[PDB]
Symmetry: C3
Subunit: 457 residues, 3 copies
């Protein structure tokens, strides 16, 4: 695959180390096996009877034979374990193939250009482009008679991103299910994006089988209805497969988010209260022919002014402030009485029960209440915002939508498995013809590179 070569030469530098990639892979596999074995051990070896005393943990550990009969007790866990083992095996094989390819890629990189591994981090990736250009000037490889230039190098790596950006600009990709009382909703979890990628670009059932070029069948105008019907049955079967596979990935996501959330639960909610970017922003804010690293730099430099503009010109709300004041005072009065009682015997056994709950109410109330130039912040934010999707109300709502809250995004990820087939069935199938029309009328064929969207030029 011609595109895969450039994609891998980019990914090697972007992962700044071959050993880094190897460690990433091996420790990802070790991760997955750690979660599976630790969950099955906690659910299949831990005996609550001895622990609850209703003592050294080694003594509390039941003998291995008892674990043998206890794991024999249920057959469903055996099927779960064998499925997990098969998944681990297939990912292991794919990863071995990937690292086997990448080592030879790095060997070719060293032979062609001879940059030592310790010097890779110092290179700003512009000299990589310059060295590749000089390689074409010296005729290292016969990659077309006309030497490759910057636009072609960018296109051969970013064709799929260009199509996805154009399709999102048209407005079809972001889910826009109508809210009952009024408003627009957005749903761009990793599950939906993966489904779109498997449906459109990569895979055996993809329209772009291999992604080299658009097949001639879709150029014909008359066969569009038959091709739309074929796509309809394809999306129906894909939705059926996703619905079949939903519960297992749901459980996996539940375990992973449980670990991630309880890691931060002990820590202060300040990190939990922070807000990062969302995938909708990473989709609607990507210029044509743009690498991921430049996008990351732009959002990194635009993070602070956007946050300042968000927290400076928030719309006022009197009723919320009044209610917060009354709740915080009542919580404070109850805490006053309770603490005065507590200070002067430790054997109450009932006060300490409500102490934590009342303190939690006080802490949420204190942070919920508000306390004591929007135009300049908006201007300096838009200086890096570049594109953009009561005027102040609309602007604040849009800025809030483009920059979601962390727990909101995690809840979106958690709810993705259940919503995986529903949106595919309800939002894509009825509007089938116009997407095929968009591919038909917005594709441009060029010599050498091949298929490029008209919106890229």
């Amino acid at each position: 695959n011609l595109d895969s070569f450039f994609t891998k030469i980019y990914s090697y530098h972007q992962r700044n180390g071959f050993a880094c990639i190897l460690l990433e892979d091996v420790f990802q596999l070790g991760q997955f096996i750690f979660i599976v074995t630790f969950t099955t051990f906690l659910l299949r070896c831990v005996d609550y009877n001895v622990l609850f005393a209703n003592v050294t943990l080694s003594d509390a550990i039941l003998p291995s034979a008892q674990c043998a009969e206890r794991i024999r007790s249920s057959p469903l866990l055996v099927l779960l374990l064998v499925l997990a083992a098969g998944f681990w095996l297939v990912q292991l094989l794919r990863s071995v193939c990937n690292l086997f390819s990448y080592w030879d890629i790095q060997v070719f990189y060293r032979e062609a250009l001879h940059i030592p591994p310790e010097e890779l981090s110092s290179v700003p990736w512009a000299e990589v482009q310059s060295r590749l250009l000089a390689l074409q000037r010296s005729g290292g490889l016969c990659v077309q008679p006309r030497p490759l230039t910057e636009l072609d190098i960018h296109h051969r790596i970013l064709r799929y991103t260009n199509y996805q950006v154009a399709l999102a600009n048209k407005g079809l990709l972001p889910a826009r299910c109508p809210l009952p009382w009024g408003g627009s909703a957005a749903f761009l979890s990793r599950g939906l994006a993966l489904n779109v990628d498997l449906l459109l670009f990569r895979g055996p059932f993809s329209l772009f089988r291999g992604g080299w070029e658009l097949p001639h069948a879709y150029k014909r105008s008359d066969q569009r209805g038959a091709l739309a019907a074929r796509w309809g049955r394809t999306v129906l079967l894909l939705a059926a497969l996703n619905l079949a596979l939903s519960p297992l990935v749901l459980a996996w996501q539940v375990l992973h988010v449980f670990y991630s959330h309880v890691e931060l639960l002990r820590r202060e909610p300040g990190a939990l209260g922070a807000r990062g970017w969302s995938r909708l922003a990473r989709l609607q804010l990507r210029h044509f022919n743009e690498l991921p690293h430049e996008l990351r730099a732009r959002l990194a430099r635009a993070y602070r002014p956007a946050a300042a503009f968000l927290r400076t010109a928030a719309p006022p709300a009197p009723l919320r402030t009044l209610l917060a004041r009354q709740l915080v005072f009542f919580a404070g009065a109850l805490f006053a009485a309770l603490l005065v009682l507590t200070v002067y015997v430790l054997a109450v056994e009932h006060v300490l029960t409500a102490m934590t709950a009342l303190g939690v109410t006080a802490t949420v109330a204190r942070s919920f209440i508000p306390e004591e130039a929007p135009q300049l912040l908006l201007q300096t934010a838009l200086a890096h915002m570049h594109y953009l999707p009561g005027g102040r109300d609309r602007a604040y709502r849009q800025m809030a939508q483009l920059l979601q809250y962390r727990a909101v995004s995690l809840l979106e990820e958690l709810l993705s498995p259940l919503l995986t087939p529903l949106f595919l069935l309800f939002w894509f199938r009825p509007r089938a013809l116009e997407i095929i029309d968009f591919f038909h009328h917005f594709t441009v064929d060029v010599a050498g590179v091949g298929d490029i969207c008209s919106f890229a030029l």
Copy 2:
């Protein structure tokens, strides 16, 4: 009352919602009833004998009959409760009158100008003035043949603030009892302000009976001595009344400040260490014909440079910091020994007693010690302060006086009931003739509006 109409049309917008006013009032009444009932319940239903164990709280609750004899046991509590009920019902009746008036005020507002309740928050109150102007141009009401101008609208609402600002800039209002060693003290608690308001502007014994016009009796030059004698009698009887009523309001203030302080006691003293504005600043630093909202906005904008100037250019103190260093080292050494003893049995039962005290000493010592352009901060503060009451020492002392500490202000509020009659007797009575002369020679009469201080123009 002509002034009351404009005052209420201002207050409706400033409370940004009729439902907001209704909820605030009803929940303030619920506030007071909750405080009284909870205090009397804790004093007359809590049984320390069973709770101290010398267990579910519901079991600890004594039967209602026993509470009946216990509340019957003392007659003083009955008088306290009946007085509280009388105060509650009087305030209830006043509040019902206020909300009944305000509902028809809002109805008239809707009929005249037709702004829905949701759109009130969006209006910057300038369009309110413009619409009222257009109403005069369209002849909505026959409020004098000459249409009302902006200065007149401001004056009819702000006459009392103008008089109070003039009287404060004369130097009479802020009580300035001399310190024994030296210096000037300022006392402007809410109690003294309420006393001045009840004496001068609002009430049956006020000089301004109704606040419409100055009575012609005070214009005569020959009667000034008799009028001063009458004012002396009035201030004596007012001081007697306030001295009679002092203990009950003192107890109420004690309860309220107890709740407020213990609400923040568990939280970090960072909020307790915060600095807020004082009423003396809100009186001396207020221009003529000035609305409360613009003053609040100006002080909100000027808050931060004032704090920066206060912290940057603090006067040096060698002896203070050196003694602080000694105390912090001694506390640290004692903490060292005590912790080393503690880490290696939990049954010491005497170490934990000194634990908290020594920790508190360490925490106060560490925060009390000092650690590593004043002109620019002073300039940017004075650019917003507009007015202003070793040069650096004098400037810093004035900036500290105009911006008090939170606990200092709360202590002033708590000490107000005892200080209520003392200052009225010792500070106002001897210098009555000059106050009478100030009212005599600083009032200018104009057509339509009426009585205006010469310092307003």
Copy 3:
């Protein structure tokens, strides 16, 4: 001593108060007596038997006679105590001499210039110079026929600092023992500075006996070998003395740093993680003829931009952050399991043992991991840095070396007693002729002032 007069007149103002100096000294004496008595009391009066219960502390205190035979039990403690008492007596006598001289100089200061003690903090020390100049104009003292100028006044106080700055600029003074794998090491603990001061400038064995003029013997070219041999035997005997005295000063430093560290141990490591200046910076960054207060002010203003430049342009570390991510994820998983086990009996007695360790590992992992214009910061730092000792790698390494870590400096101070004779033996003795030549060829004699280094002019 002519120089001592100006040195004391500077130190009086720099310590901003005679009473301050007197109390600081008497509290330093009480300081040392407190450490010695408290340490010997804890080691020779505390009975672990009764306290461990294997109760009021007063009951736990053994009788005085018991402490009598318990201190009689071992003989070396008596020698330690008598040596400490003699050391305290020596410092007490020296301190009495210093305060006796300082009262006399303060009396002369009042008689000649008449500034009250309260006004000393107000003067910026420039008026002190002006008043002294006026004193020579009026002929108060016959200090040479030619009136004293600013340069001469600065030299008579800063001759030793000038020589030390020249020596450090030559590169000899800071020890630069070579690392085994490679790199440069710096060691400028107070012990080495005291040794070089006692060997070069102040002391009976100093080359500058009294610090008034350089002896004529060192000017002769032919005697340099014999003088170098004398210096070599002197450094050998000095190293022998320091090696003999090493253990006691080591123990004293251990006790002092123990108290200092355990004072901050309970507090958050934010103060422990703070960055402070190092003596190497205070040595290489000092211009010729600069007083200590000017240097302190310069670094006070340059502290912040240097810190910003340090935290902004840190070199990337892929392997470090990847390992940190893996460790923090594993620690979080173990913390998850431990916490969910703990939430639902307090009689476990084994989980709580690893609770603190696992939490500490999680905290160090989260603190260690990295998270999301260097040229401007470097420029604004160099604007105040004036002098200066992959270009970015070299610049960051220099900025890191020039500004050490706090705990690193304390560890350097702790390790100084063991390294005290080793560097003096290994680094100074072989290079003796070159240092003798350095004094010989860069000493300039001037009328009145006397000896000034060639690099001062």
